[PDB]
Amino acid sequence: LEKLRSIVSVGDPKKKYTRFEKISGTVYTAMDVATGQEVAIKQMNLQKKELIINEILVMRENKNPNIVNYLDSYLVGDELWVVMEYLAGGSLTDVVTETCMDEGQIAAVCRECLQALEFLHSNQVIHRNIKSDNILLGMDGSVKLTDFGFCQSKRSEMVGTPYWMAPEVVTRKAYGPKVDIWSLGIMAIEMIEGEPPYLNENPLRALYLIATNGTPELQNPEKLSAIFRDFLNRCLEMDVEKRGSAKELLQHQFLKIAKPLSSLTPLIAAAKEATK
């Protein structure tokens, strides 16, 4: 608990933040009273402690501009408050479902996600859940990853479809950083198709297809540019050794058609207007 006292901040967070709106514990949106910065606050009743504290410690040291970044934490009575930056642009999922992203906007998102993965993979972190729900957007078009850990019963039934998982993860083989690269390729296909790859398809059937067919089938490849399809083929190489690393793919030609991140801002406005 003395290390818990080494991470918590001095202050009453009820005084430093206002406009608490509710949206492993509850999640509020709030606003820094002194600067007006929007924040997201997660509240957790401590009474698997030791993991929570270790994670807080590694978050605060390994900041990165393409990761939803920790701000502070507070010991509030019996519960721990963890304060993150709030990204008000919403999730990539909303953008993907309400707009048709062009390849330039896709390349931009892919570059930003690959920068995050290079950072994480250099510190030996595996995200394991690279997918559109876990990509948050800022109102200036920033792109940041969320919902992963810095630090699954065979008897249980599958809910729902794990469409983002690499073949080596579905076969429950030990796996490494390249599973994120597979997931990113799936997400790029989702962006251009407007839907996750496996709908109308049962989870166990999807599991078998991921394991057997592997490199996912896309509708009408002739819709894609040759360089986008090459990029997808580098990401979705069933052979792990051949599959590109984050560092290698940051060099890929497809990323050089990326539009400025401001090009994402009209997509955000369109998504917000549609919901509702």
Ligand X SMILES: CCCCOc1ccc(-c2cc3cnc(NC)nc3n(CCCN)c2=O)c(C)c1
Which residues form the interface with ligand X (CB under 6 A)?
A: 27, 40-42, 52, 55-56, 68, 82, 84, 86-87, 90-91, 136, 146-147, 149
Q: Give the contacts of 227 (CB within 8 A, at least 6 positions apart).
A: 253, 254, 257
CB of 68 to ligand X, least distance (A): 5
Can you tell me the distance from the alpha carbon of 7 to that of 88, in angstroms, rounded to the nearest whole number?
A: 26
Size of the site for a second copy (CB under 8 A): 26
Supply 224's token pair: 């894609």
Residues numbered 101-140 forming contacts with a second copy, rule: CB under 8 A: 129, 131, 133
162 or 216, CB closer to a second copy? 162
Least distance between ligand X and beta carbon 25 (Å): 8
As measured in angstroms, the least distance from the Cβ of 158 to a second copy is 4
Query: Which CB, 138 or 244, lies closer to ligand X?
Result: 138
Please say which residue, 41 or 189, places its beta carbon nearer to ligand X.
Answer: 41
Minimum Å gap between C-beta 174 and ligand X is: 25
From residue 237 to residue 256, what is the string marking binding to a second copy with x (rule CB under 8 A)?
--------------------
Of 84 and 210, CB closest to ligand X: 84
- The burial class, CB within 10 Å (0-12 / 13-18 / 19+), for 66 is buried
- Under the binding rule (CB under 8 A), the answer on residue 207 touching a second copy is yes
42 binding partner (options a second copy, ligand X, none; Cβ < 5 to 8 Å by kind): ligand X
Pick between residue 151 and residue 226 the one whose CB is nearest to ligand X.
151
Kindly tell me which of 193 and 230 has the beta carbon lying closer to a second copy. 193
Per-residue binding letters, 146-185, with a second copy (x by CB under 8 A):
----x---xxxxxxxxxx------xxx-------------
Q: Which residues bind a second copy (CB under 8 A)?
A: 93, 129, 131, 133, 150, 154-163, 170-172, 199, 202-205, 207-208, 211
